[PDB]
Amino acid sequence: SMKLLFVCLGNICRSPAAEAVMKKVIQNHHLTEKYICDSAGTCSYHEGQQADSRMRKVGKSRGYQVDSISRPVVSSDFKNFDYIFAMDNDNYYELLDRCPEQYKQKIFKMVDFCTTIKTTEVPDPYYGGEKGFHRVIDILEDACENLIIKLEEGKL
Ligand code: NA
C-alpha cells in the first residue's frame, strides 16, 4: 500500500542500508502488510551491483540483512512512491531537480527524521573504514524509528 523509496548516490552503501533498517522497523511495528520499501541511486554507474560488502558485513553485525542490487532512480519513481528519502543534501537537490512540481512534496531528507543524532546528512561511508558504516546505521536507526511513527500518525 504505502511505498517508501530511499535514495543515495550509488545505491550500494547508504540507501540499501536504509531499506534494510526501515524494513526491520516496519516488521518490529507489525506493519509489513502496509509498507513496501525500495532503494535507488541518483547515479546509474553502479547499476546491477550487489551492496558494498562492508555494508553487508556491518549490516549483519548490527542485525540487518543488507541485500540490494543497485538501480537508478527513474522518472516513474516520483509518481509511484508515496515518499522518497534522500541520504544527503546532494541526493535531495538532485531528486528535486528531476521531480515534477506536483510530486515534490513527497521528497524528504532522511535526517529530518532524526531525533537523537545531530547530523546534516547520512554521510557517504564508501572511502572510510568500518566506523563510517556503523555511523550510517546509527543515523538510520534514529531516523527510521521516528519516520514510522510520523507515517502512522499521518504527520506527512
Ligand atoms: Na534494486
**Domains along the chain?**
1-156 (3.40.50.2300)
For residue 103, how far is its CA from the centre of ligand 1 (angstroms)?
A: 22
Asked if 70 and 11 touch (Cβ cutoff 8 Å), the reply is: yes
Asked if 2 and 82 touch (Cβ cutoff 8 Å), the reply is: yes
CA–CA–CA angle 140, 145, 147 (5° rounding): 90
Orientation of helix 130-152 relative to helix 14-28, angle to 10°: 50
Distance CA 149, CA 152 (A): 5
Q: Indicate if 62 belongs to the active site.
A: no
Quick one: DSSP state of residue 13? S
For residue 38, how far is its CA from the centre of ligand 1 (angstroms)?
A: 7
Closest CA to 55 of 110, 107, 133: 133
Asked if 16 and 68 touch (Cβ cutoff 8 Å), the reply is: yes
Please tell me what resolution, in angstroms, this structure has. Answer: 1.9
Distance CA 54, CA 77 (A): 28
For residue 4, how far is its CA from the centre of ligand 1 (angstroms)?
A: 13
Asked if 41 and 7 touch (Cβ cutoff 8 Å), the reply is: yes
Given the residues 71, 124, 142, 144, select the one marked as catalytic.
124
Q: Indicate if 77 belongs to the active site.
A: no
Q: Indicate if 54 belongs to the active site.
A: no
Given the residues 14, 56, 62, 71, select the one marked as catalytic.
14
Give me 86's grid cell: 534522500
Burial class (CB in 10 A: 0-12, 13-18, 19+), 119: middle
Task: Please indicate the experimental technique that yielded this structure.
Answer: X-ray
Distance CA 20, CA 38 (A): 9
Residue type present at position 119:
T
What Cα–Cα distance (Å) separates residue 112 from each residue in 1, 54, 68, 92? Answer: 23, 26, 24, 12
What Cα–Cα distance (Å) separates residue 35 from each residue in 8, 87, 112, 140, 149? Answer: 20, 19, 20, 17, 13
